Each structure stands twice: as structure tokens, then as C-alpha cells.
């Protein structure tokens, strides 16, 4: 799945940041990921726990 790198790369963290302080655009990054490629979303399914886990970065 293309998420492996997504979860590893700042993609997950980075997002949390922008959306963390500036929660205006929200973590849409995911919407564009699953939407972009009709196959991505499916593979992304493995996320949720990890993806969202960071989406709520403590700091």
C-alpha cells in the first residue's frame, strides 16, 4: 500500500501540524489521498488507527 510511506513520511505528521494550529483546512490530505487514486483509498484502509493516531499529535 502507498500508505506505508505516507505513515512514515512527514505526510502524517506534517498534516497534523498545519491542521493542528491552523485547523482551517483540516487534514484533507487524506481526502485527496483516497480520492486522488481510486486504488489508494482502499490501500489506505490500513490507516485510521495510525493515520488518525498522529492526526491528534499530543503537542
UniProtKB/Swiss-Prot annotation:
Compartments in which it is found: Nucleus
Domain of life, per lineage: Eukaryota
The family this protein is said to belong to: Belongs to the RAD23 family.
Oligomer status and interactors: Interacts with XPC; the interaction is suggesting the existence of a functional equivalent variant XPC complex. Interacts with PSMD4 and PSMC5. Interacts with ATXN3. Interacts with UBQLN2.
Domain commentary: The ubiquitin-like domain mediates interaction with ATXN3. The ubiquitin-like (UBL) and the UBA (ubiquitin-associated) domains interact intramolecularly in a highly dynamic manner, as each UBA domain competes for an overlapping UBL domain surface. Binding of ubiquitin or proteasome subunit PSMD4 disrupt the UBL-UBA domain interactions and drive RAD23A in to an open conformation.
Biological role stated in the UniProt entry: Multiubiquitin chain receptor involved in modulation of proteasomal degradation. Binds to 'Lys-48'-linked polyubiquitin chains in a length-dependent manner and with a lower affinity to 'Lys-63'-linked polyubiquitin chains. Proposed to be capable to bind simultaneously to the 26S proteasome and to polyubiquitinated substrates and to deliver ubiquitinated proteins to the proteasome.
Protein name, entry field: UV excision repair protein RAD23 homolog A
Taxonomic placement: Eukaryota, Metazoa, Chordata, Craniata, Vertebrata
Residues of the full protein shown: 230 to 288 of 363
Amino acid at each position: 500500500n502507498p500508505l506505508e510511506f505516507l505513515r512514515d513520511q512527514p505526510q502524517f505528521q506534517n498534516m497534523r501540524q498545519v491542521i493542528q494550529q491552523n485547523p482551517a483546512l483540516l487534514p484533507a490530505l487524506l481526502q485527496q489521498l483516497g480520492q486522488e487514486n481510486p486504488q489508494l483509498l482502499q490501500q489506505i484502509s490500513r490507516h485510521q488507527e495510525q493515520f488518525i493516531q498522529m492526526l491528534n499529535e499530543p503537542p
